[PDB]
Design a protein around this motif. Structure first.
Motif, PDB file in Angstrom:
ATOM      1  N   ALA A 161       0.839  -1.191   0.000  1.00 32.17           N
ATOM      2  CA  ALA A 161       0.000   0.000   0.000  1.00 32.17           C
ATOM      3  C   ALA A 161       0.884   1.256   0.000  1.00 32.17           C
ATOM      4  O   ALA A 161       1.864   1.293   0.743  1.00 32.17           O
ATOM      5  CB  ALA A 161      -0.906   0.004   1.225  1.00 32.17           C
ATOM      6  N   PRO A 162       0.600   2.292  -0.816  1.00 35.44           N
ATOM      7  CA  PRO A 162      -0.541   2.465  -1.703  1.00 35.44           C
ATOM      8  C   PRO A 162      -0.218   2.331  -3.186  1.00 35.44           C
ATOM      9  O   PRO A 162       0.870   2.692  -3.664  1.00 35.44           O
ATOM     10  CB  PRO A 162      -1.000   3.889  -1.361  1.00 35.44           C
ATOM     11  CG  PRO A 162       0.271   4.605  -0.879  1.00 35.44           C
ATOM     12  CD  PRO A 162       1.359   3.547  -0.756  1.00 35.44           C
ATOM     13  N   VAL A 163      -1.199   1.806  -3.906  1.00 36.40           N
ATOM     14  CA  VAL A 163      -1.145   1.701  -5.351  1.00 36.40           C
ATOM     15  C   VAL A 163      -2.107   2.782  -5.795  1.00 36.40           C
ATOM     16  O   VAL A 163      -3.307   2.712  -5.503  1.00 36.40           O
ATOM     17  CB  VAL A 163      -1.479   0.295  -5.918  1.00 36.40           C
ATOM     18  CG1 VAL A 163      -1.578   0.334  -7.442  1.00 36.40           C
ATOM     19  CG2 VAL A 163      -0.437  -0.732  -5.472  1.00 36.40           C
ATOM     20  N   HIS A 167      -5.276  14.123  -4.721  1.00 34.11           N
ATOM     21  CA  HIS A 167      -4.677  13.144  -3.801  1.00 34.11           C
ATOM     22  C   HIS A 167      -3.732  13.722  -2.735  1.00 34.11           C
ATOM     23  O   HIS A 167      -4.198  14.095  -1.655  1.00 34.11           O
ATOM     24  CB  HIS A 167      -4.027  11.981  -4.584  1.00 34.11           C
ATOM     25  N   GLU A 168      -2.424  13.828  -3.072  1.00 31.93           N
ATOM     26  CA  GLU A 168      -1.287  14.327  -2.282  1.00 31.93           C
ATOM     27  C   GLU A 168      -1.563  14.849  -0.829  1.00 31.93           C
ATOM     28  O   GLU A 168      -1.959  16.012  -0.664  1.00 31.93           O
ATOM     29  CB  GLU A 168      -0.454  15.325  -3.109  1.00 31.93           C
ATOM     30  N   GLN A 169      -1.349  14.014   0.230  1.00 35.07           N
ATOM     31  CA  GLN A 169      -0.902  12.611   0.203  1.00 35.07           C
ATOM     32  C   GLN A 169      -1.756  11.772   1.198  1.00 35.07           C
ATOM     33  O   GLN A 169      -2.940  12.073   1.381  1.00 35.07           O
ATOM     34  CB  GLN A 169       0.609  12.531   0.505  1.00 35.07           C
ATOM     35  N   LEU A 170      -1.167  10.732   1.827  1.00 34.88           N
ATOM     36  CA  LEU A 170      -1.855   9.881   2.803  1.00 34.88           C
ATOM     37  C   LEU A 170      -1.185   9.893   4.178  1.00 34.88           C
ATOM     38  O   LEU A 170      -0.024  10.297   4.305  1.00 34.88           O
ATOM     39  CB  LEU A 170      -1.978   8.441   2.290  1.00 34.88           C
ATOM     40  CG  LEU A 170      -3.114   8.192   1.312  1.00 34.88           C
ATOM     41  CD1 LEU A 170      -2.650   8.351  -0.121  1.00 34.88           C
ATOM     42  CD2 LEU A 170      -3.728   6.824   1.523  1.00 34.88           C
ATOM     43  N   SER A 171      -1.928   9.463   5.209  1.00 37.44           N
ATOM     44  CA  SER A 171      -1.415   9.373   6.573  1.00 37.44           C
ATOM     45  C   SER A 171      -0.822   7.986   6.789  1.00 37.44           C
ATOM     46  O   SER A 171      -1.062   7.087   5.975  1.00 37.44           O
ATOM     47  CB  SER A 171      -2.508   9.684   7.595  1.00 37.44           C
ATOM     48  OG  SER A 171      -3.461   8.646   7.745  1.00 37.44           O
ATOM     49  N   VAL A 172      -0.022   7.819   7.861  1.00 33.89           N
ATOM     50  CA  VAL A 172       0.630   6.544   8.193  1.00 33.89           C
ATOM     51  C   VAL A 172      -0.435   5.456   8.402  1.00 33.89           C
ATOM     52  O   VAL A 172      -0.352   4.398   7.770  1.00 33.89           O
ATOM     53  CB  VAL A 172       1.642   6.656   9.389  1.00 33.89           C
ATOM     54  CG1 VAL A 172       2.214   5.289   9.781  1.00 33.89           C
ATOM     55  CG2 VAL A 172       2.779   7.631   9.075  1.00 33.89           C
ATOM     56  N   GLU A 197      -3.565   5.363   7.418  1.00 38.34           N
ATOM     57  CA  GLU A 197      -4.335   5.108   6.198  1.00 38.34           C
ATOM     58  C   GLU A 197      -3.673   3.927   5.485  1.00 38.34           C
ATOM     59  O   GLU A 197      -4.336   2.932   5.187  1.00 38.34           O
ATOM     60  CB  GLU A 197      -4.342   6.359   5.286  1.00 38.34           C
ATOM     61  CG  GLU A 197      -5.523   7.292   5.508  1.00 38.34           C
ATOM     62  CD  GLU A 197      -5.300   8.758   5.171  1.00 38.34           C
ATOM     63  OE1 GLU A 197      -5.550   9.612   6.052  1.00 38.34           O
ATOM     64  OE2 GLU A 197      -4.873   9.057   4.034  1.00 38.34           O
ATOM     65  N   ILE A 198      -2.347   4.024   5.289  1.00 36.20           N
ATOM     66  CA  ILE A 198      -1.564   2.988   4.635  1.00 36.20           C
ATOM     67  C   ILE A 198      -1.396   1.745   5.502  1.00 36.20           C
ATOM     68  O   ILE A 198      -1.421   0.631   4.986  1.00 36.20           O
ATOM     69  CB  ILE A 198      -0.270   3.490   3.910  1.00 36.20           C
ATOM     70  CG1 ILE A 198       0.830   3.952   4.871  1.00 36.20           C
ATOM     71  CG2 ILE A 198      -0.589   4.556   2.849  1.00 36.20           C
ATOM     72  CD1 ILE A 198       2.204   4.072   4.207  1.00 36.20           C
ATOM     73  N   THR A 199      -1.298   1.931   6.821  1.00 35.68           N
ATOM     74  CA  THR A 199      -1.187   0.817   7.775  1.00 35.68           C
ATOM     75  C   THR A 199      -2.477  -0.033   7.764  1.00 35.68           C
ATOM     76  O   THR A 199      -2.395  -1.262   7.874  1.00 35.68           O
ATOM     77  CB  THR A 199      -0.791   1.331   9.179  1.00 35.68           C
ATOM     78  OG1 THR A 199       0.437   2.066   9.092  1.00 35.68           O
ATOM     79  CG2 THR A 199      -0.657   0.213  10.212  1.00 35.68           C
ATOM     80  N   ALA A 219       0.916   4.639  17.054  1.00 32.61           N
ATOM     81  CA  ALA A 219      -0.466   5.102  17.096  1.00 32.61           C
ATOM     82  C   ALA A 219      -1.352   4.221  16.226  1.00 32.61           C
ATOM     83  O   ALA A 219      -2.366   3.727  16.706  1.00 32.61           O
ATOM     84  CB  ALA A 219      -0.531   6.544  16.620  1.00 32.61           C
ATOM     85  N   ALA A 220      -0.914   3.975  14.976  1.00 31.13           N
ATOM     86  CA  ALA A 220      -1.589   3.158  13.977  1.00 31.13           C
ATOM     87  C   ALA A 220      -1.679   1.714  14.433  1.00 31.13           C
ATOM     88  O   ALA A 220      -2.777   1.176  14.516  1.00 31.13           O
ATOM     89  CB  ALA A 220      -0.844   3.249  12.659  1.00 31.13           C
ATOM     90  N   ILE A 221      -0.520   1.113  14.792  1.00 32.20           N
ATOM     91  CA  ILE A 221      -0.391  -0.273  15.268  1.00 32.20           C
ATOM     92  C   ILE A 221      -1.327  -0.603  16.444  1.00 32.20           C
ATOM     93  O   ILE A 221      -1.943  -1.677  16.447  1.00 32.20           O
ATOM     94  CB  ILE A 221       1.108  -0.633  15.485  1.00 32.20           C
ATOM     95  CG1 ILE A 221       1.632  -1.502  14.324  1.00 32.20           C
ATOM     96  CG2 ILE A 221       1.426  -1.264  16.860  1.00 32.20           C
ATOM     97  CD1 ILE A 221       2.033  -0.741  13.040  1.00 32.20           C
ATOM     98  N   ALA A 222      -1.462   0.363  17.395  1.00 33.52           N
ATOM     99  CA  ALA A 222      -2.324   0.337  18.571  1.00 33.52           C
ATOM    100  C   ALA A 222      -3.801   0.265  18.165  1.00 33.52           C
ATOM    101  O   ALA A 222      -4.511  -0.623  18.639  1.00 33.52           O
ATOM    102  CB  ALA A 222      -2.084   1.584  19.395  1.00 33.52           C
TER     103      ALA A 222
END
Ligand code: 3WD
Ligand code: GTP
Ligand code: GTP
Ligand code: LOC
Ligand code: GDP
Ligand code: GDP
Ligand code: MG
Ligand code: MG
Lengths: 430, 430, 123, 429, 428
Positions: B265-267, B275-280, B282-284, B322-325
């Protein structure tokens, strides 16, 4: 890499010479053998069928063979005719008398060794010989007899290479030569063991096509030959033209042939045009897909709907929409699903060539491995068993020092192929 | 130091190699001649007294075409002619030809070239093998090679990047056979294998890149981004992170359970404007959605034995945690009770580099999630069914047998596959 | 009561109460060394036993690093010997398939001869 | 007449640093060996052909550190390099390390210094051994040496000066092991032993010297007063305790109950306004108050067996006997049956010298008090229990067995200390 | 005299900080030269530094790593210019978090190379006390080679003392699955081969950073700051001249009552944050009770679940010795249930007039509490989790190992826990 081609007998040379005409024009080759085409792609895989001779000339890797000078001379005096190397014309005078045993055993064996002399010579000039290609009638003397003698004799010398044939199936609709079933039965046996793949070209289908569809009251050999030439450029397309494959006779055999004895293919073409007739307007993508799977379009007189497809290969030619091509292809095997074996997953492959055939803006060629073909053999066996029952025209054969037992053998060999065809037809996944 | 020799076998292997290799050149400022204006990339590139940088790679194929396209290519100068090995005859989609008949003839010369690339290794980590599951060379030759390196280099690390066959992306009737035979013969010799399901790559182009009919170029370039992400940890050295082999330890609990599942991710299509861009996060999160998996399977239903996140571009632990949690709260990520619930995280500095005149867009941050889920065993099970279908009838088996193989090999290979399925069943028990 | 009188000193006994009861009560170098040397032995023996344990632990390492090596020169031996038979069996097999298909073709070449012979016999 | 003063380990060395500091002051010797214009001070000093008076002392320690602090200080010149013996590493608070390990290594070398010290005598009285109780050096080595001094210079007397360990004063957790093991080994070899409870000294530097947390220096300044007040008669021309053999006679009736309890008066500070300096009776009554005791025990509850009152300075006999009469008037103070109820008074007219620029201030009158009371058992019982708690669960023992010694020697030591405890029971009736 | 060996990522990082922390306390600028104020700093400089006249003061340290990486970090580091080049003993094949690689295969190749260095560094000492190892127990180099080194050292200097700063792993800090295997295998070797072992638990250092220091996202720099703090505080009595006047072996004799029970619970008060912020003095009780509380311990064990066999406590700076002594005896009189009664005055307090850098009053604590079995159970549980199913074991058996060696490691450690639970239940 390269293919060595052998055309045998009246029909072998007749169909062979038209194949050579068709494909030469497709490749920018004129009758003098010089090139004057506009696309590089024509020469890209030219090395398959043509020997790049001196003076930037291209000359077919073709051997012309007959036990009569007749057809041989017409070809030599033909439109392209001059194009072939005259050393490769391996011809006899004796005749084969529409007798398989004269061909395979007597008059034929006297010329066989002289043929292989030329075949060795053409095999030498190969960076990597792929295999052989034979055009022949299974109803004559030279085509059926000496053509299968050559198969057996090439097979001995080049076991490692592919053996592919364009065999033309006899019909009463075309030839009132009573013994034709005998010759056809004996050849089919030889084919079942000696070739890797055979495109069964039924003259019953051919006559019917010209007659019922093309509305030719009294169709000629010229009329049937046009369909055969149509079919041939079709089947050979991926071998001659560059595309998304890669492009081998072996790869095709490995994919199309699930069981050894079962390598008789039912060709089919679409559109079906009359000989030298300017094309009306082009067929749409579905029209091609539909027609291609129609019994009415089949080069062998069998109903694909009376059987099950082990494997199918379809070649689309011309600059058409592949998304449309793929949409249709699936639709077909999703309704007609019940005509394709569940035990050969994904048994229908599809190829597209932007290079359309002459005078056609859009064509499609079909190659199928249908159990339906057992109908072809059944017909032959029926006609054979009739005469054989009577011990009809049998001294023509035993006169070449042959055996009645050879016939009874061949009869059963034919029958076993039908029993084998029906075995897998009936066969379920469970 | 920490050297890494790449091997590209067959059509799929070579073409993926080219996609990988052009991207690698971009990542490390390398020009197609070899010259370039973090000494860490040397793990992949050898350097001469002239200043030209050459890849630590070998392109093998049983036929010329594919490799010749490199030889006349835009990077004809990027490799040594010595390191691009072609045969003259392909394996005609036959494992028995790749492994025996044909590949036997090339093997010694290949290993000999690999050894010459090896002699230039102050401390070689191991090998990276790029092949097809389907092709006769990608299957048979690969296994032969892996078998011979296990003799030659002993217990030295061997990695795979195999291409799981899909109907939508070419494929041939006999590929399930080739697929099963290889896995079996390779099993012992492989340390860890990255399975790539062509359908997934297809589906990702179709859905994210919006490509109605994706080209091998479109697929291969996509694949390269995932591979370069897996190898970033070797061609780059950052304080931040980047650390493979350590992942390998978490991913592989038992020798045979060595096939991770990659979720990239991301394709993004190079036409998605604003677009420009994405958060951690979002991709996680994107990693946990199946529509991003490299192999089509259902990990929501299976169990996990490892989870690894490979971040790149602009990533700070603050928000990775934060994402992993947020993820670890949700109960769909169920791990086994014999291994911990932590996700091993690695972060790169070098942003994902995109191919000039490409299909993908430039990303501020990309992620690849490697994980050991029991659900990958679904790909095996899928392949096995198609095998069972044909084998039940021994459809196409004559081709193998004719090349020297034994029916026994198929059963042996099949039992192995079945034991591997049981190994995944057994392992997911709590 | 007095004791004694000195220079830059003096002394004197002072009795306040008398004693109730009149009556009062109711080494070698070898053996020190024998004892010292005896404890030195004990210190030297426990040192020696501790040395023995480390020597066995050293040997252990020799054996483990040895197994790791032996385990490799068995893996390579198998992979190689497996390969030898696999390549050989295939050789024999493919060649026998090829040898049989030629016998069959030569067998049918036999038939041909006797047919040409049977044509002569009829004549 | 002559006397060898041996200083064993960190404690004994530091304490001996102070004693010779005070003897040099009393006799008028300079820290270089020279002196200006009674003579008996020689019983501690040997003269060189270059008029210097070298202290008849041998300072031993298994670590260099402590002794270097002497062979750097102003009193470096005093002693020869031979008399200051140092090792590379100390007994690491282990008695077994001091006695069996680092012991064997250094024994002879130490004895040889003593031999060459002894080869300079008209007749050696004995030895005065200075050490701690809880130190691995000031216990393991000392006891090993005391064993050898008894064989090599047999029959000669021994006056032990030991520092009884106390929590308030840098004590280590293994100290009671060391403390008893030493007492078991140093038993049959000591003729007389004077304990110095570090708690008692600490207290006296507080309540009387106004120093909350006293330094070793301060504690040692006090120790030396008492030690010098003991050796008063030896170094000068006194009558009571003229020889080392007098102590055995005057204080030690039963051979193993050789632990007299000391008492000093007055304990005076300098940082305070002047006042009327104390009379004889003022400092005499102070000799029976537990606040001024060298060791921590209740002599009010325990039968006595001897008593000696050692006076210094501006003292008068009539003023002494008048104070002895006053004590028996109010208090009765018990004694053992087999012993006469009475003191042995001795007055040395030499002034009480105090370290110039120290915590201790100038005094004209002073009195130390030697007394053997059964109450000293109360000091042993404190230690015997500490030992018994640890040995009960074998805590730290491993270190002792590791240095060679047998576990058999721990029980053996305590068993003997349990017999010594019953000896105060047999006597204290 | 003391020789300092540091092994692995952790070991060198931890060690490099202790070496830069003490150099500030001793006036040694990163170019190896005395620039300190008082001669009190040079008084016991010979314990850790050698003279290269110079003056030039070189740390008596050996840098050990099976891969270069970490060494180069220190080389390129701030204090780095201080170490003897001849003392960087590294490899190229990194053990890769494998106790087997570090202890067996890989380390064995680099072992003798290191030992020859230590041989040299020991010839330059008048009288050595022993050795000091800083290493983690979760990786390969520090975990395996570090143990192997200890063993080969024990074999070379039996009489010398073995001191370790072992960083215990946690599932919270680091995600390498194999960790309990490495740890248990190391622990098994420490129980037998070291004399004092400072048990630093990462679980604890993270929780201190996270909860108490309010550090939202703790870094290694942060964890290491707390370790370096303690590592200087525990060595205050070795390098700083006070009334103590003690060493490594006297500390062992007094702390360790039973050979196997020699794993100490480190503790520091106040718990300073990196760089920021200092200000406001500490009251004596504030400093004392903080130090005796569990939220100040570098080991993840509640001392209220055990009994203190022995306690060591160094207080730094200018303070009333009275007030400190008053506070110690108050604490012991309060929480007497958790102090072994069968070992008299088992709580020892030290003082040093020179306070540490930035904080003008600190107190380091060393407890030998039965509670430490909780740290081992915690490890033994994680071990057996993977071990019952024989998970990840292949990585070790591939290195020439046997399952037997894992059984033994856990068994020897399970025995250690049963050993702590004897004196945990025992009275007087
Ligand atoms: C729980 C442990 C964990 C690994 C930890 C640290 C590690 C760290 O700080 N690391 C791992 C590389 C180095 C270091 C840091 O990032 C450069 C710097 C500041 C540092 O301390 N670096 C130095 C020491 C230092 C001190 C002072 C100033 C500069 C440097 C080191 N060099 C080498 C070894 S330690 O990341 C924040 N962490 C909370 C994490 O968030 C990590 N995640 C995890 O562990 C989870 C999510 C539980 N799986 C991950 C996303 C980074
Ligand atoms: N992703 C991807 N798949 C490919 C590519 N080329 C072939 N494939 C896949 O690989 C299989 C065909 O194998 P090939 O690599 O073409 O065959 P090969 O035998 O190894 O090589 P050749 O003999 O030269 O054709 C099918 O499953 C295809 O979908 C490619 O470049 N990319
Ligand atoms: N009064 C007093 N007691 C001391 C002195 N030095 C140490 N002690 C005490 O002696 C006991 C410990 O003995 P040490 O002499 O220091 O130890 P050692 O083993 O003999 O010598 P080292 O090992 O060299 O330190 C403790 O009770 C200390 O308080 C000192 O100068 N004065
Ligand atoms: C090298 O540094 C030290 C060395 C030691 C001690 C110590 O703690 C105060 C140290 O500081 C860390 C020490 C320790 C514990 C004791 O009892 C548990 C003891 O009685 C006694 C001690 C020390 N002795 C004294 C009287 O402080 C000697 C050993
Ligand atoms: N389509 C087609 N069939 C032919 C042709 N010539 C002969 N045949 C068929 O082939 C059979 C006779 O074979 P033929 O080639 O004449 O005999 P041969 O020359 O002795 O081998 C009959 O069944 C005819 O229908 C031809 O040019 N085209
Ligand atoms: N406290 C602390 N732990 C560390 C540090 N670096 C790594 N670790 C820990 O070390 C363990 C792995 O060992 P490591 O030192 O990286 O590897 P080695 O090179 O094989 O010794 C893990 O439990 C990490 O949490 C550090 O600087 N401080
Ligand atoms: Mg192939
Ligand atoms: Mg000592």
């Amino acid at each position: 890499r390269e293919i060595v081609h052998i055309q045998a007998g009246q029909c072998g040379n007749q169909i062979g010479a038209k194949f050579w005409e068709v494909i030469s024009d497709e490749h920018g080759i004129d009758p003098t053998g010089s090139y004057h085409g506009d696309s590089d792609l024509q020469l890209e895989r030219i090395n398959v069928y043509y020997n790049e001779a001196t003076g930037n000339k291209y000359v077919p890797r073709a051997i012309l063979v007959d036990l009569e000078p007749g057809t041989m001379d017409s070809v030599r005096s033909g439109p392209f005719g001059q194009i072939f190397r005259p050393d490769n014309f391996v011809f006899g005078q004796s005749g084969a008398g529409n007798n398989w045993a004269k061909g395979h055993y007597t008059e034929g064996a006297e010329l066989v060794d002289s043929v292989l002399d030329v075949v060795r010579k053409e095999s030498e000039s190969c960076d990597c010989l792929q295999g052989f290609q034979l055009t022949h009638s299974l109803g004559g003397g030279t085509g059926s007899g000496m053509g299968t003698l050559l198969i057996s004799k090439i097979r001995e010398e080049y076991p490692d290479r592919i053996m592919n044939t364009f065999s033309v199936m006899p019909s009463p609709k075309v030839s009132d030569t009573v013994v034709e079933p005998y010759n056809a039965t004996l050849s089919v046996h030889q084919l079942v063991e000696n070739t890797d793949e055979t495109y069964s070209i039924d003259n019953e289908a051919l006559y019917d096509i010209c007659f019922r569809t093309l509305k030719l009251t009294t169709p000629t050999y010229g009329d049937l030959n046009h369909l055969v030439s149509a079919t041939m450029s079709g089947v050979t397309t991926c071998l001659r033209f560059p595309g998304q494959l890669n492009a081998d006779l072996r790869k095709l055999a490995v994919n199309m042939v699930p069981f050894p004895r079962l390598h008789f293919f039912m060709p089919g073409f679409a559109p079906l045009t009359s000989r030298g007739s300017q094309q009306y307007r082009a067929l749409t993508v579905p029209e091609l897909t539909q027609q291609m799977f129609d019994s009415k379009n089949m080069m062998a007189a069998c109903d694909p709907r009376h059987g099950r497809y082990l494997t199918v290969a379809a070649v689309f030619r011309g600059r058409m929409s592949m998304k449309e091509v793929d949409e249709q292809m699936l639709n077909v095997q999703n309704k007609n699903s019940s005509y394709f074996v569940e035990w050969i997953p994904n048994n229908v492959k599809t190829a597209v060539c932007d290079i359309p055939p002459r005078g056609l803006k859009m064509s499609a060629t079909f190659i199928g491995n249908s159990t339906a073909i057992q109908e072809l053999f059944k017909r032959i066996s029926e006609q054979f068993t009739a005469m054989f029952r009577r011990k009809a025209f049998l001294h023509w054969y035993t006169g070449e020092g042959m055996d009645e037992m050879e016939f009874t053998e061949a009869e059963s060999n034919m029958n076993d192929l039908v029993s084998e065809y029906q075995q897998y037809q009936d066969a379920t996944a469970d | 130091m920490r050297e890494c020799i790449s091997i590209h076998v067959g059509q799929a292997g070579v073409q993926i190699g080219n996609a990988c290799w052009e991207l690698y050149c971009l990542e490390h400022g390398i020009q197609p001649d070899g010259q370039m204006p973090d000494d860490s990339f040397n793990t992949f590139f050898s350097e001469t007294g002239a200043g030209k940088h050459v890849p630590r790679a070998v392109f093998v194929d049983l036929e010329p075409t594919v490799i010749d396209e490199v030889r006349t290519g835009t990077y004809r100068q990027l490799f040594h002619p010595e390191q691009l090995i072609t045969g003259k005859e392909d394996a005609a989609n036959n494992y028995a030809r790749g492994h025996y008949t044909i590949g036997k003839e090339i093997i010694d010369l290949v290993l000999d070239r690999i050894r010459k690339l090896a002699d230039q290794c102050t401390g070689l980590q191991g090998f990276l093998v790029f092949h097809s599951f389907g092709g006769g060379t990608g299957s048979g030759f690969t296994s032969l090679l892996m078998e011979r390196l296990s003799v030659d280099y002993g217990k030295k690390s061997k990695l795979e990047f195999s291409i799981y066959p899909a109907p939508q992306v070419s494929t041939a009737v006999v590929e399930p056979y080739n697929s099963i035979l290889t896995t079996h013969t390779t099993l012992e010799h492989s340390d860890c294998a990255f399975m790539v399901d062509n359908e997934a790559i297809y589906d990702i182009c179709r859905r994210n890149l919006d490509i109605e009919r994706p080209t091998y170029t479109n697929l291969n370039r996509l694949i390269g981004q995932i591979v370069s992400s897996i190898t970033a940890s070797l061609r780059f050295d950052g304080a931040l992170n980047v650390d493979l082999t350590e992942f390998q330890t978490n991913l592989v609990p038992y020798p045979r359970i060595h096939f991770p599942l990659a979720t990239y991710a991301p394709v993004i299509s190079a036409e998605k404007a604003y677009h420009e861009q994405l958060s951690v996060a979002e991709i996680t999160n994107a990693c946990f959605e199946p529509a991003n998996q490299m192999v089509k399977c259902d990990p929501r239903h299976g169990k996990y034995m490892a989870c690894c996140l490979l971040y790149r571009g602009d990533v700070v632990p603050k928000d990775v945690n934060a994402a992993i949690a947020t993820i670890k709260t949700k109960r769909t990520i169920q791990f086994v009770d014999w291994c911990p619930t932590g996700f091993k995280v690695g972060i790169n500095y070098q942003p994902p580099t995109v191919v000039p005149g490409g299909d993908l867009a430039k990303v501020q941050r990309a992620v690849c999630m490697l994980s050991n889920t029991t659900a990958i065993a679904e790909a095996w099970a899928r392949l096995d069914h198609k095998f069972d279908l044909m084998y039940a009838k021994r459809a196409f088996v004559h081709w193998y047998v004719g090349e020297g193989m034994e029916e026994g090999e198929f059963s042996e290979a099949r039992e192995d596959m079945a034991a591997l399925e049981k190994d995944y069943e057994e392992v997911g028990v709590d | 009561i007095e004791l004694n009188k000195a220079t830059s000193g003096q002394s004197w006994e002072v009795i306040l109460k008398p004693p109730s009861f009149d009556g009062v009560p109711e080494p070698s170098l070898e053996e020190i060394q024998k004892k010292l040397e005896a404890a030195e032995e004990r210190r030297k023996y426990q040192e020696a036993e501790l040395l023995k344990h480390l020597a066995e632990k050293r040997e252990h390492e020799r054996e483990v690093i040895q197994k790791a090596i032996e385990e490799n020169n068995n893996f390579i031996k198998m992979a190689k010997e497996k390969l030898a038979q696999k390549m050989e069996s295939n050789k024999e097999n493919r060649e026998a398939h090829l040898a049989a298909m030629l016998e069959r073709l030569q067998e049918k070449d036999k038939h041909a001869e006797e047919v040409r012979k049977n044509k002569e016999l009829k004549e």
